[PDB]
Amino acid sequence: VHHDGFQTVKATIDWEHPMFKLYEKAKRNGKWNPADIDFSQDQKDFASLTSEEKISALPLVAGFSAGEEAVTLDILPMAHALARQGRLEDVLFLTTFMHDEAKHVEMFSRWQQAVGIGQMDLSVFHNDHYKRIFYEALPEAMNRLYADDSPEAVIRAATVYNMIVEGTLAESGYYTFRQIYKKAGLFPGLLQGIDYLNMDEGRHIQFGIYTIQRIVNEDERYYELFIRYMDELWPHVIGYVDYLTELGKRQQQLARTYALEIDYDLLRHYVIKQFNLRKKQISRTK
Amino acid sequence: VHHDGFQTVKATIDWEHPMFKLYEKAKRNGKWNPADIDFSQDQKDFASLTSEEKISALPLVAGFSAGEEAVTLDILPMAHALARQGRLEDVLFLTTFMHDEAKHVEMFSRWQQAVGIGQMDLSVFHNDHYKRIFYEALPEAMNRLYADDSPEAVIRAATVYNMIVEGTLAESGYYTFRQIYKKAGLFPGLLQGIDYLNMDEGRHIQFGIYTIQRIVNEDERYYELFIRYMDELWPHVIGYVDYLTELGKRQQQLARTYALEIDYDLLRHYVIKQFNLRKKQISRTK
Numbered sequence: 252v253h254h255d256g257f258q259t260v261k262a263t264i265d266w267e268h269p270m271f272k273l274y275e276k277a278k279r280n281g282k283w284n285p286a287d288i289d290f291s292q293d294q295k296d297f298a299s300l301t302s303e304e305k306i307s308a309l310p311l312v313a314g315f316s317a318g319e320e321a322v323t324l325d326i327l328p329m330a331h332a333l334a335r336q337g338r339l340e341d342v343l344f345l346t347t348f349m350h351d352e353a354k355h356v357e358m359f360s361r362w363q364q365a366v367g368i369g370q371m372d373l374s375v376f377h378n379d380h381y382k383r384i385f386y387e388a389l390p391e392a393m394n395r396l397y398a399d400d401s402p403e404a405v406i407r408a409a410t411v412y413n414m415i416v417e418g419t420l421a422e423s424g425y426y427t428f429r430q431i432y433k434k435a436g437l438f439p440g441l442l443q444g445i446d447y448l449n450m451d452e453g454r455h456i457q458f459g460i461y462t463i464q465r466i467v468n469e470d471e472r473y474y475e476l477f478i479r480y481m482d483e484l485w486p487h488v489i490g491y492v493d494y495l496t497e498l499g500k501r502q503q504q505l506a507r508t509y510a511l512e513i514d515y516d517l518l519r520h521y522v523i524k525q526f527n528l529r530k531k532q533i534s535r536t537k
Numbered sequence: 538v539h540h541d542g543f544q545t546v547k548a549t550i551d552w553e554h555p556m557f558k559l560y561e562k563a564k565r566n567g568k569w570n571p572a573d574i575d576f577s578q579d580q581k582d583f584a585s586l587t588s589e590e591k592i593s594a595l596p597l598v599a600g601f602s603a604g605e606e607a608v609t610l611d612i613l614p615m616a617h618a619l620a621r622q623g624r625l626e627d628v629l630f631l632t633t634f635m636h637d638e639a640k641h642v643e644m645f646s647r648w649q650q651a652v653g654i655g656q657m658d659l660s661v662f663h664n665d666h667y668k669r670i671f672y673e674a675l676p677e678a679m680n681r682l683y684a685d686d687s688p689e690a691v692i693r694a695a696t697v698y699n700m701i702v703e704g705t706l707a708e709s710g711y712y713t714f715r716q717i718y719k720k721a722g723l724f725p726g727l728l729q730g731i732d733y734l735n736m737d738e739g740r741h742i743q744f745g746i747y748t749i750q751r752i753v754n755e756d757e758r759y760y761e762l763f764i765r766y767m768d769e770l771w772p773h774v775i776g777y778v779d780y781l782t783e784l785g786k787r788q789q790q791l792a793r794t795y796a797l798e799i800d801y802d803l804l805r806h807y808v809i810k811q812f813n814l815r816k817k818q819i820s821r822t823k
């Protein structure tokens with residue numbers, strides 16, 4: 252459908268818009284390139300491990316690789332919906348969001364290739380709860396925006412993408428990687444990637460907070476919808492976490508070899524904490 | 538609609554894919570930031586000009602600013618269509634394409650703001666032929682891909698976007714800027730931007746060539762469609778060029794002051810040459 256006119260011909264970019272500022276920060280802080288990371292030491296670590304210890308890191312990598320690919324594809328409808336609404340500054344920012352996720356897909360795929368498991372199909376570590384979030388709910392909620400860009404639909408998309416997938420699962424995954432592999436002194440290239448990912452993620456979550464809060468600001472009754480959509484996905488979040496935990500408790504060999512005291516209770520409480528903390532970053536009033 | 542699985546969990550990125558290589562080149566060669574460009578000398582040049590000379594550069598800037606905004610919005614459906622087809626490497630590359638165009642929108646808008654014409658509505662320099670391409674045909678052809686991703690639709694979208702808008706109009710515009718303002722020693726910040734834009738554009742055009750050629754490779758009869766879609770838009774291309782030329786010939790004061798011999802015939806032949814050259818980068822056979 253036709254353009255009526257163009258903001259940057261009639262006027263200029265809104266230089267003070269919060270998403271324009273976030274866009275500027277993303278260009279400044281987003282120079283990293285997965286292709287520059289040295290994975291040579293990761294190859295050697297992984298080869299040195301036994302079959303049993305080798306398996307241990309794969310479930311978390313399986314979760315991340317599919318998750319990065321899902322969001323790369325599933326962010327496009329949000330960019331379209333906001334473009335149609337004429338929110339140019341949000342679109343500018345979303346180009347950095349999409350390009351970030353592309354590099355995240357690239358980072359985990361380079362690690363898989365480097366350590367010699369590219370040919371292995373890691374879908375075996377996606378349980379039913381994971382599939383519900385990443386194979387189904389995420390794409391349903393985002394694709395909806397093509398035909399329905401009501402405040403209800405936008406809130407649900409932002410909640411599932413930014414507050415659950417990124418703000419709850421991804422954040423807890425970064426924490427888990429550091430608690431286990433950083434302590435062991437294993438997989439330095441991967442952990443360097445994880446640090447860059449964690450920094451990009453801060454902006455992604457802030458876009459979701461901005462989006463949800465500007466809709467709640469119009470009608471405080473959307474606050475209840477946000478809470479409800481958070482709670483709907485909790486059982487799948489914790490059902491995936493419990494599955495990973497249970498795989499971890501059965502495959503102890505890595506924790507024994509590296510003298511790691513993997514506290515699964517601490518990791519569980521971190522996920523619960525992340526979830527409640529995201530809930531609290533949205534104000535009912537304002 | 539649900540994901541069936543994920544390429545980077547089952548396998549890896551296709552490291553040898555042409556669009557993966559182009560994506561790698563884009564990350565290496567796309568570090569520039571419009572926010573770093575010094576426009577202080579451009580402000581002074583523009584202030585030093587008289588009202589008559591001031592007007593002279595505005596029509597070309599008006600064309601570019603709207604053009605950059607249109608493609609930023611209108612590339613999204615191509616990314617979606619290729620994602621739905623499972624072309625992950627093309628999607629990775631398109632994140633760099635979209636982010637490039639965002640910086641291009643930003644560059645011209647910063648120049649407008651800097652030289653003191655942000656508040657001026659430059660839509661007055663968009664004639665009917667321009668509107669036909671940028672307000673109508675471009676968004677029609679791209680939005681079609683949401684509901685129709687047939688080889689016919691993809692070829693038409695790539696032809697209008699990459700071969701006409703970028704490969705014919707944008708390229709001739711970069712050439713025009715250099716022939717006029719670079720010779721005058723005017724607007725150094727802007728010309729620095731134009732150099733970065735011209736470098737990004739090389740990748741954008743290569744994506745269009747790749748896309749059109751891989752469809753023609755399947756059925757040489759799509760070649761005729763490509764030619765036909767090129768020819769359909771020619772009258773609007775040359776109708777806009779003739780309008781700009783005619784504005785240029787009426788406002789001679791800048792060319793006189795800076796001792797510039799603006800050869801409008803040369804600029805016209807460059808557009809004609811660009812158009813035929815794009816036609817020839819697609820092989821009917823292969």
Ligand SMILES: CCCCCCCCCCCCCCCC(=O)O
Pocket residue numbers: 311314315318319322352355416417420421423424427455492495496518519522
């Ligand atoms: C064993 C403790 C459980 C910790 C939770 C681990 C969650 C794994 C992360 C997989 C999904 C990551 C989603 C990526 C989101 C993004 O890239 O923006």
Ligand SMILES: CCCCCCCCCCCCCCCC(=O)O
Pocket residue numbers: 597600601604605608638641702703706707709710713741778781782804805808
């Ligand atoms: C006076 C000689 C005519 C030269 C032709 C000038 C064309 C102006 C360019 C306006 C459209 C630019 C489109 C941008 C495309 C992109 O950013 O990929």
Ligand SMILES: [Fe+3]
Pocket residue numbers: 322352417451452455
């Ligand atoms: Fe993210």
Ligand SMILES: [Fe+3]
Pocket residue numbers: 608638703737738741
């Ligand atoms: Fe371009």
Ligand SMILES: [Mn+2]
Pocket residue numbers: 380490
């Ligand atoms: Mn269960």
Ligand SMILES: [Mn+2]
Pocket residue numbers: 666776
């Ligand atoms: Mn005419």
Ligand SMILES: [Mn+3]
Pocket residue numbers: 319322351352355448
């Ligand atoms: Mn990510």
Ligand SMILES: [Mn+3]
Pocket residue numbers: 605608637638641734
């Ligand atoms: Mn451009």
Ligand code: NA
Pocket residue numbers: 259260261262263649654655656657658659
């Ligand atoms: Na303006």
Ligand code: NA
Pocket residue numbers: 363368369370371372373545546547548549
């Ligand atoms: Na794999």
